[PDB]
Amino acid sequence: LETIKKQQELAKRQVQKDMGSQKEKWEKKKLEMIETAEASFHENLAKNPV
Amino acid sequence: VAKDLMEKFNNYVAQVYVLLGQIKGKTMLPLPSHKLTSKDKAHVFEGSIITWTKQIKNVLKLEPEQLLKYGNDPGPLAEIEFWQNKRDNLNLIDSQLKSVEVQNILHFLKSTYTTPFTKLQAEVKKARLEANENYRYLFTLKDLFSKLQESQPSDFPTLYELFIPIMHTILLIYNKSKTYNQPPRLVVLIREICNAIISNAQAFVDKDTIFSLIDSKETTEACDKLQVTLDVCSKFKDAYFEYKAKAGGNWKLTSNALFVRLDSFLERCQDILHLTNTIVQFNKLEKIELGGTKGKTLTESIAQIFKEFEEAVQAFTSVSYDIMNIAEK
């Protein structure tokens, strides 16, 4: 039971550490930057045949 | 028989030219055309060979490659490039095929000549569509390299994020081309490329490694990682849905049936995850030592239940064949 009790204390710490406020928003900003870079590359790819 | 024997030799030469085109890139019509002709029948024989070349271009299709497994994102772009190259070679071959003497033969009885000439014009059109498809295919080939290069280590935790931009480039590709022929057919090729790429990544994550872990039964985080790989698959579908909203009409895709292959693999993987999680719970039960009220008899029953779970693992644990094959039921 003490070992199980210890895991529960760790469980609060795992959620508080791994999950943070606006975690998705930070990920979305990174995705938007990748999309903008990809859009610039696609225009360059379109340019080569023309 | 002398002239007849010569005609038979010419037919054999035409067959050899066709064999070279098969191993080589077509050009059967140049071999079919008579050389140093002084008769009318010989010119007709050359024309018949030209008709076969047009049939070969029509016979090749994106759907046939998709039916025989394959359908990789890199492979579909390569097939379009190969088809465009063959059409370009055929167009160059047609210029050579359309000699002054060849035109005269068509004039001297002419419906057969007209059918091949119309077929050649269709190939020139289809060929222009193929060239647009080939530019799209080169873009897809770059996307395939960003997937083919993968050493089957990580990738899904990064690829899932990378899936949304890759989907966005395809959305842009339809608009840039505009006159792109077989646009609905091309979509089918895309979904096939995505599902094929996902299947290769899924196999690397599980296969022998998944069987080895379950037998050891000392890994849990790995079970969570298997769920994470499925998430990447869900993210691609989510991104595909997001792409449809971005696309605004003409969604096409037909993932419901087209995505059934990808959906079936995910369902099999989910069942393993549902069962794998239960196995972890059984290990915890063995460790439990309540020692409350009546003792030993309750523990013996609990011990048998833990053994019972191990016995099930030994049946499933042996895993003859299996290895989570999507095809195997």
Side-chain angles (χ1 to χ4, degrees), chain A residues 1-17 20 25-50, chain B residues 2 14 21 25 30 32 42 47 64 71 74-76 78 116 122 127 131 153 157 165 183-184 196 201 203 222 239 245 247-249 255-329:
Chain A
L1 287 189
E2 279 208 6
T3 78
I4 283 181
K5 206 173 194 175
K6 281 193 172 179
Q7 279 192 356
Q8 289 207 354
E9 314 168 30
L10 285 151
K12 329 165 187 176
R13 276 49 187 190
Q14 294 206 46
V15 185
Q16 287 188 22
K17 303 179 180 180
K25 299 183 181 179
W26 277 94
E27 301 167 0
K28 289 179 180 180
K29 295 178 181 180
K30 302 173 183 178
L31 291 174
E32 291 174 357
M33 184 176 181
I34 299 179
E35 290 172 359
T36 60
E38 265 53 327
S40 70
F41 291 144
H42 104 56
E43 297 174 1
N44 304 351
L45 292 179
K47 287 172 183 179
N48 307 339
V50 175
Chain B
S255 60
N256 304 2
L258 178 290
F259 272 88
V260 175
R261 180 192 178 188
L262 297 177
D263 295 0
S264 57
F265 185 94
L266 292 194
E267 291 177 355
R268 174 166 297 80
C269 183
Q270 284 180 4
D271 295 359
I272 306 178
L273 269 282
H274 285 309
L275 295 174
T276 70
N277 301 355
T278 77
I279 304 177
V280 176
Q281 303 175 349
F282 301 134
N283 304 358
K284 298 183 178 181
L285 169 158
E286 161 210 19
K287 186 173 181 58
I288 305 181
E289 282 288 17
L290 295 174
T293 81
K294 49 182 179 180
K296 302 178 302 179
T297 63
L298 289 187
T299 79
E300 283 171 359
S301 179
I302 292 180
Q304 292 182 3
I305 295 183
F306 175 64
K307 290 183 179 181
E308 177 285 339
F309 168 63
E310 178 183 4
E311 297 162 349
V313 171
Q314 190 170 2
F316 174 99
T317 308
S318 63
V319 82
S320 61
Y321 293 93
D322 304 357
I323 306 179
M324 293 183 284
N325 287 1
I326 173 179
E328 304 185 20
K329 297 184 178 181

